[PDB]
Amino acid sequence: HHHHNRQQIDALVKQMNVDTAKGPVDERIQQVVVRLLGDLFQAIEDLDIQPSEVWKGLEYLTDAGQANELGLLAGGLGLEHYLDLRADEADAKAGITGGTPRTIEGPLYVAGAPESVGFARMDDGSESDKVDTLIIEGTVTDTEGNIIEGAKVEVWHANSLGNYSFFDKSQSDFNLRRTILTDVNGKYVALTTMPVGYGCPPEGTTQALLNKLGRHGNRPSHVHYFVSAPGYRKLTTQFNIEGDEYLWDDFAFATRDGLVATATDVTDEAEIARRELDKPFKHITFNVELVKEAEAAPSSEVERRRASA
């Protein structure tokens, strides 16, 4: 079934995609296209991939893009996590150590969330009779424990049904999405609701492929973070919550040591009063340590197309 060897493949790819060039070429795009096409052709030879199979793959990719699910698929196949594995190894080779660990962004960030100093309430109260109240708090410091005032703590997470605002058009705009600037003591406090883990859209393209792979499409409960500050490396991270069925079986492979938090229960009447609440709530501490930006440091910032509102 081998109709072409790699030499013959490379010659064909060059004839079609390089020899045909006239005028200015983007050299990087040319390099990447030539490599990926040659690899695709060689996989077609090695696995004897039939035209009907190739068309099914392209039809799948078309459907995935129309469903806006390619970011989700990048998470599920483990490509998004792989990019973090690479970034961690690049940082190790730079001698950059310390700092809260990174993990995946996911595909559901939205720019433009309400900003406040030191404290934000993240939810609109529309689920107050059906989900636990959660307070999250932490201090943002450098690697030696010195507080950072004015650090930008961006948080987003799912509602009691595992759905995110903007994508779920039934929620109010920016529900469960906030930017909190750390106060004079380096502190942030978020008053919110307990996120639940969630699956992929069950009739969607990502779950369709996971089904063929015998795989589930679930993530454990988590809260996403961007943390940034002048003079420090930007951090993309999350915490997961101890106790979740899928904690160490995340379909997007994002859970890490250092990023698992325990939700404590507060039933004490005095403490409840102090928080201006009326019922028991859950409490999570999540401190963040940022690494100073050095001339030698690889960038920790990632350009990516992101929703805005």
Added chain:
Amino acid sequence: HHHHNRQQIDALVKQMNVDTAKGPVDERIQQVVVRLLGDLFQAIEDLDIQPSEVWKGLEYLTDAGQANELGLLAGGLGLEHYLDLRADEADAKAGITGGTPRTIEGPLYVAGAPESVGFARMDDGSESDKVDTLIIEGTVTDTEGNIIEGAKVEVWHANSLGNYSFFDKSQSDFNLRRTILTDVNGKYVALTTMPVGYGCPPEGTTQALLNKLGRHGNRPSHVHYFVSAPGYRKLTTQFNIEGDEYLWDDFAFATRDGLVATATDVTDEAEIARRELDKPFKHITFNVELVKEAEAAPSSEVERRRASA
């Protein structure tokens, strides 16, 4: 910049996509996914592809799918032609020789076109004052020249502006698309208009990438064919027209020896009368030779998602 070797990549891909499987798996889909992901990860290592670059690639693929242009991109990068190169080599190894050569289908077939016996007029006459009339005719035979009656000759082509019906919603439904069944003499005749070659949509995703590659997105003038008959191998082919600027510079690499036709000019008053026309016209002969279906023969039919109306 090499953070992982292929052994480490393969182990990671297995951990994420295979070890996580529970219950029935589609073994072929699993095999192909594992191979393509491992290859993608290795290309990322070898070329030190940055997260921002990966996200740009996925955003491009998303945009391409939303624009319904991935079939067009398959043609332009030469993947569609490569599939034919493979099919030709498989046929050679089977000892299948003879027959009109195959070439690419393109992405613009529509099922459901008007059917008639022996003769069809393909155009609605809406361009009669701005484009040349073309008569196409041919005989469909086996490899020894014996006529085949009742062969299904499916033809589609572009209008005077290089646009195809169904996709160009300004044209009448099925304009320049017909199915003609060969008559008792194995003959088909199509009365139509001269197609013009065309480019990719200039603001679309395919041309955007071709621009980065320094490449044009043009095809020479051509008419597409499916030819099928009981007992014979289905044929996907075209003819191109001698004289076209892009005849041997097709951005989708479809031109072949054996598939170039010369448009003859008919100015003779007697012949014009015979055809029931009033002006000179162009004439193309395109005969088709079909190969008998043998038990040993690979399939020449391709399952593919196709428009219908």
